[PDB]
Amino acid sequence: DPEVTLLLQCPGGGLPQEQIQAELSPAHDRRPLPGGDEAITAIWETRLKAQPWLFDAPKFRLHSATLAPIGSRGPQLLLRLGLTSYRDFLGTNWSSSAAWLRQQGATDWGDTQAYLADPLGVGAALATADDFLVFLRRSRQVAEAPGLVDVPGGHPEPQDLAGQLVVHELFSSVLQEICDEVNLPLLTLSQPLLLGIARNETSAGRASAEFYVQCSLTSEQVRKHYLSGGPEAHESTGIFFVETQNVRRLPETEMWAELCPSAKGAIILYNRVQGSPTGAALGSPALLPPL
Numbered sequence: 074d075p076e077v078t079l080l081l082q083c084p085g086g087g088l089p090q091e092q093i094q095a096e097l098s099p100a101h102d103r104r105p106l107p108g109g110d111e112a113i114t115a116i117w118e119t120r121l122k123a124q125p126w127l128f129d130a131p132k133f134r135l136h137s138a139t140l141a142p143i144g145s146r147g148p149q150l151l152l153r154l155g156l157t158s159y160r161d162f163l164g165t166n167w168s169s170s171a172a173w174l175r176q177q178g179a180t181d182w183g184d185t186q187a188y189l190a191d192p193l194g195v196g197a198a199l200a201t202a203d204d205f206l207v208f209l210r211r212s213r214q215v216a217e218a219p220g221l222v223d224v225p226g227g228h229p230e231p232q233d234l235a236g237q238l239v240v241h242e243l244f245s246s247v248l249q250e251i252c253d254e255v256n257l258p259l260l261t262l263s264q265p266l267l268l269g270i271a272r273n274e275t276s277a278g279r280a281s282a283e284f285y286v287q288c289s290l291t292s293e294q295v296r297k298h299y300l301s302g303g304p305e306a307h308e309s310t311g312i313f314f315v316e317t318q319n320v321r322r323l324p325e326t327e328m329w330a331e332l333c334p335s336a337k338g339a340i341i342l343y344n345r346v347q348g349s350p351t352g353a354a355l356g357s358p359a360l361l362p363p364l
């Protein structure tokens with residue numbers, strides 16, 4: 074799977090909100106482009122003169138994420154974040170020249186990402202009461218990953234002493250994206266656990282935080298809520314469910330070639346962090362069948 078790389082695998086089965094610190098600093102921003110940010114402004118002007126209803130939005134930028142020594146007390150993860158925008162994404166990661174910008178960043182800064190917007194995504198491994206994960210089908214008419222399978226998620230918009238409010242917005246945003254697209258009541262969802270961070274090498278290395286969320290509704294009840302919104306209540310074109318039993322071997326299935334990179338990252342981290350038991354009971358052959 075060359076189109077996804079793991080940047081972070083969380084310990085303890087995943088981290089709760091209270092164990093994460095954020096540092097939001099202009100030191101974590103994209104570097105100005107070598108020949109100037111006028112190249113971004115030109116791409117944006119061309120796009121608005123074809124689609125004048127488009128609008129810019131702020132985004133968080135991922136610089137890096139440092140895990141504490143395993144088994145330690147106190148905060149377990151430090152997220153170093155800057156600020157970026159949808160406009161800067163279109164002019165860098167989404168540009169035909171994105172690979173040239175990665176090479177220039179290695180040369181100038183020793184950092185393949187230094188010239189890339191790198192907006193932070195969120196995604197969820199969303200489990201039902203009857204032990205299935207939730208999958209969504211993308212429209213065949215959108216620009217990114219048309220017709221592919223995704224999981225619930227999105228790219229959160231901004232608004233440890235500004236830090237804790239940023240971590241709160243990240244955790245809040247993955248629940249809001251589940252309520253907006255799957256049409257589930259907020260009170261049927263668990264507090265999220267962070268499983269890790271995955272990079273999309275098809276989008277010049279932009280990263281997504283991948284979370285585990287449990288729902289108190291069955292697969293049948295989740296399906297009814299999604300469909301009862303009607304076609305205008307969701308961007309996806311369909312919902313479907315895979316038993317958690319079967320997610321273990323998903324990379325060996327024909328479904329794997331249909332998954333978009335950020336959804337592949339969610340399922341790899343689910344299998345490594347929530348699956349893959351370490352104890353004698355769940356690791357016994359009848360409960361963890363060999364192969």
Ligand SMILES: O=C(c1csnn1)N1CCOCC1
Nearest residue numbers: 132158159162192227228229
């Ligand atoms: O929020 C984002 C986004 C992706 S990368 N940074 N921003 N979207 C949603 C709307 O359609 C375009 C992509």
